[PDB]
């Protein structure tokens, strides 16, 4: 609704980042992405759940290697805003 959440580039405290791949668009979910990247963690539009592979498939993108590299957010890649200590990308063993 009208209030719910307020941060505009404050997202980074939220549990859920801004995730687009190609034609797709969703919402990583760092709590259901801890468990893996084969858990359904992207949440599309149509609040569908998708692994971080089915939603590169939504775009046309499964021909991809990396799925950080082709999913974009907010206009930067995740490998990018990893870099910046932005997004956690799982629990980092080491």
Known sequence: GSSGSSG???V???????VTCG????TLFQEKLKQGASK???QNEAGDW???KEFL????RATSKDW????????????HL??????????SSG
């Open 57 to 60: 498939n939504e775009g046309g």
């Open 8 to 10: 505009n580039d404050a």
């Open 68 to 79: 950080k590299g082709v999913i974009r957010c907010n206009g930067e890649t995740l490998r």
């Open 82 to 91: 990893e870099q910046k200590g932005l997004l956690f990308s799982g629990p």
């Open 12 to 18: 980074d405290f939220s549990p859920t980042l801004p």
């Open 23 to 26: 034609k797709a668009k969703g």
């Open 50 to 52: 998708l692994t971080v």
């Open 40 to 42: 359904k963690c992207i």
